[PDB]
Amino acid sequence: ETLNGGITDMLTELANFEKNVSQAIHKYNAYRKAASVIAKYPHKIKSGAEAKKLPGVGTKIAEKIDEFLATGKLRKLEKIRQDDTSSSINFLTRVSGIGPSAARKFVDEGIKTLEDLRKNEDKLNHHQRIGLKYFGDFEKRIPREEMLQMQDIVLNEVKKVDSEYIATVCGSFRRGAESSGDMDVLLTHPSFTSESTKQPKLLHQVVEQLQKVHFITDTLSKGETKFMGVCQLPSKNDEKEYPHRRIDIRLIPKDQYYCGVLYFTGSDIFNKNMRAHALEKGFTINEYTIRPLGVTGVAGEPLPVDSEKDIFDYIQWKYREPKDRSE
DNA sequence: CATCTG
DNA sequence: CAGATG
Ligand code: NA
Ligand code: NA
Structure with missing residues (x-):
């Protein structure tokens, strides 16, 4: 937990790179168990030889432990840190919808920045396009005080649509947390369950409401049981408009609510x-x-x-x- | 996992 | 349909 941290930490950057830059799912998958085991490991690994001992811990890793143990650095790590290429990936990847796969392509086309993107909005998809358009906002944590406001909204409109709906806003929000990332709402209905063969309107109907009244501003992906989107707290008496929020609504068969709800x-x-x-x-x-x-x-x-x-x-x-x- | 693209 | 993203 702190006895072998940097080690577990180098492993982690290492692994992350593999899978983000290189395609080395293999290797990548490797750093991971690696970090995982040394992590539970109960002693102060003084040397690579000591780690190798461990399972997952091969000769190469031990290579890397020894050096980093030997010098507060890694050349590979350090060389990786500068590398503009690796940087762009790790970066663009911050846009919603931009994954690594796409990270590569863009770079490979020379898109490597915010501006790059705007300049080439065309090469982006609806999701990626929204992702980029609310780049900032999406990065912004959600203060509880806003959360309660939103919740008040979601719940009131759902109620309106059918006294029979049961919404729950899960996450840390639920756990109490002072801030949150995104609004996560768990949705069900009596008239919807396990065997109960569909009723897509169950999810749609609401989506519409939230959109009627302007709460929800954009669709990321609206499926027949999962809607991925964007919502906004109405700007009161103009001077202070709210940030645009990541909200996700999901239909659930009543016979399955609390299991998830728990979860x-x-x-x-x-x-x-x-x-x-x-x-x-x-x-x-x-x-x-x-x-x-x-x-x-x-x-x-x-x-x-x-x-x-x-x-x-x-x-x-x-x-x-x-x-x-x-x- | 469920949606999306192309 | 494979393959990506969240
Ligand atoms: Na081993
Ligand atoms: Na992304």
Whole structure:
């Protein structure tokens, strides 16, 4: 956790590069387990020879540990840091919709900057185009105070559309966090579930509302159960307009709500711990369900849950307010 | 994973 | 359809 940090950290830049610049999924995948194991490793790795010992830890890595151990630097790392090429990728990649794959192509066409992009908006797609157009805003963290305002909006319009809707705004927001990245809303309806063969209007209808009243400004991808978008807090009495926000709405069959609701809410650490416990308590949990685990090795059959409470119950645990869901 | 592109 | 992105 701090005893072998830089090591795990160099590994990480190394790995990241591989997969972002080079295409070395192979190698890339390698730095990773690597970082992962040294990470759990309980001692002060004094040498490469010491790491090699570890599994995942090959001769090359040990090569890299020794040098970095030997000098507070890595040549490769250092050479990688300057390299304009590697920089452009790692950069453009910051635009929504611009991945690495596209990172390469653009650079390879000589687009390597914000301006580059604008100049060539044509080579970008709707998503990439919005991505670039709200470059800044998208980079901006979300203050709780805004979050509550938005939530108030989402919930009011959904209500309006059907008293039967059940929205939940998950994430750290839910966990209490002072700020957030993006607005994540979990959506269901009675009239929608497991067997219940579709009803796409279920998701559409709302999208429209939020768009009616101008909350949602753009579509990233609107599918039949997942809409990826952009929303905005109405600018009050003009002088202070809000930033443009990344909002994501997803339809869920009522018979599956709280499982997800739990889940999306995190934290990741909480999930695992909660997941492992389930397992003890004779069960299994995942994003959609919680099932009675048999002895033969495995077994299923989705237990029926009416709230986040039913779940906890199942695994015989302390109902935890979203707050303490930390770890 | 579900949507998108081309 | 493969392949990318989030
Ligand atoms: Na090894
Ligand atoms: Na991106």
